[PDB]
Every structure is written in C-alpha cells, then in structure tokens.
Design an enzyme around this catalytic site. Structure first.
Site, PDB file in Angstrom:
ATOM      1  N   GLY A 169       0.808  -1.199   0.000  1.00 57.42           N
ATOM      2  CA  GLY A 169       0.000   0.000   0.000  1.00 57.42           C
ATOM      3  C   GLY A 169       0.851   1.264   0.000  1.00 57.42           C
ATOM      4  CE1 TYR A 176      -6.589   1.593  -1.121  1.00 63.13           C
ATOM      5  CE2 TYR A 176      -7.803   1.290   0.924  1.00 63.13           C
ATOM      6  CZ  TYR A 176      -6.626   1.575   0.263  1.00 63.13           C
ATOM      7  OH  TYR A 176      -5.486   1.813   0.999  1.00 63.13           O
ATOM      8  CG  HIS A 187      -5.553   8.786   7.138  1.00 69.26           C
ATOM      9  ND1 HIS A 187      -6.777   8.817   6.501  1.00 69.26           N
ATOM     10  CD2 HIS A 187      -4.652   8.409   6.198  1.00 69.26           C
ATOM     11  CE1 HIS A 187      -6.619   8.483   5.233  1.00 69.26           C
ATOM     12  NE2 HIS A 187      -5.340   8.233   5.024  1.00 69.26           N
ATOM     13  CD  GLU A 189      -1.912   8.887   2.639  1.00 73.68           C
ATOM     14  OE1 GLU A 189      -3.071   9.355   2.793  1.00 73.68           O
ATOM     15  OE2 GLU A 189      -1.653   7.668   2.486  1.00 73.68           O
ATOM     16  CG  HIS A 275      -6.808  12.527   3.281  1.00 70.22           C
ATOM     17  ND1 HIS A 275      -5.476  12.780   3.528  1.00 70.22           N
ATOM     18  CD2 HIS A 275      -6.878  11.232   2.892  1.00 70.22           C
ATOM     19  CE1 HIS A 275      -4.771  11.685   3.298  1.00 70.22           C
ATOM     20  NE2 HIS A 275      -5.598  10.733   2.912  1.00 70.22           N
ATOM     21  CB  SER A 287      -4.527   4.633  -3.388  1.00 72.04           C
ATOM     22  OG  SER A 287      -4.466   3.904  -2.180  1.00 72.04           O
TER      23      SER A 287
HETATM   24  O1  LIG Z   1     -10.433   4.798  -0.342  1.00 73.22           O
HETATM   25  C1  LIG Z   1     -10.226   4.879   0.850  1.00 73.22           C
HETATM   26  O2  LIG Z   1     -11.052   4.287   1.720  1.00 73.22           O
HETATM   27  C2  LIG Z   1      -9.060   5.628   1.366  1.00 73.22           C
HETATM   28  C3  LIG Z   1      -8.244   6.232   0.234  1.00 73.22           C
HETATM   29  C4  LIG Z   1      -7.064   6.977   0.788  1.00 73.22           C
HETATM   30  O3  LIG Z   1      -6.873   7.030   1.985  1.00 73.22           O
HETATM   31  C5  LIG Z   1      -6.116   7.661  -0.138  1.00 73.22           C
HETATM   32  O4  LIG Z   1      -6.290   7.626  -1.333  1.00 73.22           O
HETATM   33  O5  LIG Z   1      -5.059   8.322   0.367  1.00 73.22           O
HETATM   34 FE   LIG Z   2      -5.041   8.634   2.780  1.00 67.22          FE
END
Ligand SMILES: O=C(O)CCC(=O)C(=O)O
Ligand SMILES: [Fe+2]
Ligand SMILES: [Zn+2]
EC number: 1.14.11.66
Length: 347
Positions: A169, A176, A187, A189, A275, A287
């Site tokens: 990840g 997802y 949160h 990253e 976010h 992602s």
């Molecule tokens: O899709 C999600 O549940 C989280 C996506 C995410 O955290 C991101 O793209 O940084």
């Molecule tokens: Fe995120």
C-alpha cells in the site's frame, strides 16, 4: 510578494485538466500543480485527458479475491465517532458487488450531494457495511506508462532500491472495493507522504480535507475529544479510527474543504494533509504513496504512532544523505531544527 500565496490563502481544493503532453511526466506535473498552490489545501483533483485509459475493460475481474474484507462498526454521537474493523474472511469481487447492490446495503435515494452527505452523517452508525480494502494489486495494463500507480518512478523508490524493503500500500499498490457508507477516517499518510488515488469505476467517493497549514489545529481538537487515545499514542489518529463530521469542524473553527471524486478521476493528497471521506456506493479505487524532494523535511519530522509495534517507519537516512548532504552531519547528531513552510513549493 512571496510567491507562496498562489492558492490565494484560501487553501482551497483545486482541480486540474492536464493535456496528454503535461500528463506524461508525473513528477513534473506534481511540481507544476504545487507551483499553482494546490498543496495548500492538502488535497487536489486531476482529471486525465479524455483519450486516456489505464485498462481496456473491467469485465474480467469478478473472480478477483478480496482476502481480508472488513465490516465497519461505528460508535459515537453528535459528530464524533470511532470506527472498529472486523475481519470478515475472503470473498470474491462478484460476491462483494452482490451485497453492495442489494437493497440492504445499496445507496439511498437523493437529489443533491448535500442530501447524500446528510444521510451519511445520520446513519453511519447503522447497518455496518463491508469494505473490500487494502487488496494488494493493480488494474493497470502493463503498457500504460502514464500515471501507473504500480510504477510512478518517484524518489520514494529509493526505499526499495536501497534496502529491498517493500511496504504494501505504501511503495506497492492497493485496491479498494467499497459500497455505500464505507469510509476512511481522518489521517495523513504514513511518514506524512503523498498519496495518489484513482477511481477505476463505480459510484463517487467524497473527500474532506484540512490544509496542512492547519493540521496541528485538527490534532488539538481531536486530542480534546479523545483524551484517552491521545495519551496511549502520540499519533492516535494514525490508528485511522476517528471520524469527525464537517459540522463539528465548522463549530470549532477548523478550516476544511470538500470534494467529490468521480470514476476516471485522480485524487492527490499532500504531505501532512489530513483527509477523510466515504464512498457513495459500489466502486473500485487503487492507490499508493509517493515522495517528492519537498516531502523529505516532512518525512524527517513525521510524528509516528508508538503503541502499535508494527506501524510504518521508514529510515530517512538515505534521503538526507542524498538530497541534504550539507545537513546530514547536523541532522544525524539530532540537532537539525528546521521549520517547515507549508506554502513553499518544490524548487
Ligand atoms: O479509499 C479509501 O477508503 C481511502 C483512500 C485513501 O486514503 C487515499 O487515497 O489516500
Ligand atoms: Fe489517505
Ligand atoms: Zn498508536
């Protein structure tokens, strides 16, 4: 004066429409949108040039396995919630969409997004949905050389290159599969890196973002509401279990913006950009994280979760040495007191 104020200090979420030309060089375009002040908002949207596709068709995937599907139980009231995960056990995509589209878990009827948003905050603690999250894998076809989440070629690669270390990840892609009301808690990253998110198909995914310039304020507010958690861990928000409604943020003067992501669109989160959000209905997203030179400082000062002894911790040594040689000796001696300027771009 001071080019900083490019995103006229409204740190508003910006949207870009690159030409296949500018869209070809990923690292270049990120530096470009930062020069436009996109990072100020912590989140930015990038619409790919119409004649661009990462995959021919998503018909050949119902057999794909979601090894660790998760049921999301949410507890809380009046804007403050905690999300608990429950490992169900593997199921196929085909099996997942069944549930997602059943009237038991399908999207409710609504007109404006504002309406769908109200229903989300009203019923998030009811009917715990299932989220097919953190599935290792890509849906990009090998030939796609533009914005391929599997191989963006940013300096984050130095981690793999240097130590052979792989982090699912983080420096590897995640898929997802979501449904109505599945959500991601507030949160930043891991190591405060950037993240890229592509919504392959399905219903939208809405996002909330707090300017990194005001990230510290969000933390103080969260600390005050969950004092028990704030003491058991320096960075409890990294547990990704805290949900806070837009009304609670408004009530406490915490600046933020919202944006809805649609199929075929990219979302980009910036270093120290907090976010959160939720999915409208059945959909699929991919992602991973990535880095830039501007990220290094954030990486050096990222506050990590202490309690959990399996949290993501990256050695900054190789980055400081290679991009900040004049400061390596000082940093290594634990005496580098550099302050970060969230407005400043990546020259
Ligand atoms: O899709 C999600 O549940 C989280 C996506 C995410 O955290 C991101 O793209 O940084
Ligand atoms: Fe995120
Ligand atoms: Zn922790």
């Amino acid at each position: 004066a001071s080019e900083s104020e490019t995103l006229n200090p409204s740190a508003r979420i910006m949207t870009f429409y690159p030409t296949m030309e500018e869209f070809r060089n990923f690292s270049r375009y990120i530096a470009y949108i930062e020069s436009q002040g996109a990072h100020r908002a912590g989140l930015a949207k990038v619409v790919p040039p119409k004649e661009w596709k990462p995959r021919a068709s998503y018909d050949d995937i119902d057999d794909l396995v979601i090894p660790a599907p998760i049921q999301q139980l949410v507890t809380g009231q009046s804007g403050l919630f905690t999300q608990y995960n429950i490992q169900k056990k593997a199921m196929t995509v085909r099996e997942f969409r069944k549930i997602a589209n059943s009237d038991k878990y399908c999207t409710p009827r609504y007109s404006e997004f504002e309406e769908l948003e109200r229903k989300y905050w009203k019923n998030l603690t009811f009917n715990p949905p299932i989220y097919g999250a953190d599935v290792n894998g890509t849906l990009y076809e090998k030939h796609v050389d533009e914005w391929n989440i599997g191989r963006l070629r940013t300096i984050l690669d130095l981690v793999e290159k240097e130590s052979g270390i792989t982090i699912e990840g983080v420096n590897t892609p995640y898929l997802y599969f979501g449904m109505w009301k599945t959500s991601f808690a507030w949160h930043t990253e891991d190591m405060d890196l950037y993240s890229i998110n592509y919504l392959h198909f399905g219903e939208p995914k809405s996002w909330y973002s707090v300017p990194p310039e005001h990230g510290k304020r969000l933390e103080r507010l969260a600390k005050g509401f969950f004092p028990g958690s704030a003491q058991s861990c320096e960075a409890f928000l990294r547990h990704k279990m805290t949900l806070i409604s837009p009304l609670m943020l408004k009530k406490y003067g915490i600046p933020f913006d919202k944006v809805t992501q649609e199929a075929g669109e990219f979302m980009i989160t910036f270093p120290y950009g907090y976010h959160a959000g939720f999915n409208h209905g059945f959909n699929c997203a991919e992602s991973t994280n990535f880095a830039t030179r501007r990220w290094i400082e954030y990486g050096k000062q990222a506050v990590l979760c202490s309690c959990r002894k399996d949290m993501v911790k990256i050695s900054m040594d190789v980055f400081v040495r290679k991009f900040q040689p004049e400061r390596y000796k000082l940093w290594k001696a634990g005496k580098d007191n550099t302050v970060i300027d969230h407005t400043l771009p990546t020259p």
